[PDB]
Design a protein around this ligand. Sequence first.
Ligand SMILES: COc1cccc(NC(=O)Nc2ccc(S(N)(=O)=O)cc2)c1
Ligand SMILES: [Zn+2]
Length: 257
Amino acid sequence: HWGYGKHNGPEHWHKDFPIAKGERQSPVDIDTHTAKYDPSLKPLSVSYDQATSLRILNNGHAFNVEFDDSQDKAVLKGGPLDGTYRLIQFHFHWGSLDGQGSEHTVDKKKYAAELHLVHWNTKYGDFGKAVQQPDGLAVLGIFLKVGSAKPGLQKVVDVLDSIKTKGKSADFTNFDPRGLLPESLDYWTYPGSLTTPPLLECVTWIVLKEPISVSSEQVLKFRKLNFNGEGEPEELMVDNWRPAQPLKNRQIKASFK
Ligand SMILES: COc1cccc(NC(=O)Nc2ccc(S(N)(=O)=O)cc2)c1
Ligand SMILES: [Zn+2]
């Protein structure tokens, strides 16, 4: 089964998921000098005041904070998007060391980690139908650098002890994702894919320019999680990132001058 080891990591995925070598795969390097300001882009609209988190799950590749998406509560609109996209989960990708861990890079710079807030287009009715469409998903990507602590992240960090191994979950209500956003919503955007199998080409990527700062102690607790299940040999959950993929026939657009 796929993962991030030497025998099953990203260079192997194309054997079970041939779309891995496709025309709109993610992540990519963001070359800041080639991304063109697009004055037709609108400001992002992030409406998370009514978000309802339910649960946190270690799925063996990352941990997902899951939301109730049965009504239009926490939604992403505007920016490059047409229509309304509903928040379903967020998760992170991170490194074994502070010098790597993000999936997108900026002028080849790797950040310590990257947050993905995953939303689906309500015109397709459910997430499973949305991922079959080229405009089915919108993922908001936020870089993490190591410095000062992020207070709004600490409630996530403190529950990770209870979901150390694959398949463990814990109740996780009343978490406010507004506490994970940077001050500025300036962004880059391009058409891409899921960055894990099945690597479907269904995502409008919206990557914020401003990273958030987290503390060394916070990211250290990410790195104590396990890829393995309970009672299996311990394999630390680190370096769960896909490297940058070819840009091919795509343009990255900037919302800012
Ligand atoms: C309970 O919550 C669910 C329920 C059903 C599906 C999912 N998500 C999923 O299947 N895949 C996914 C999402 C984003 C990315 S990524 N790294 O490109 O942002 C990669 C893969 C979550
Ligand atoms: Zn992701």
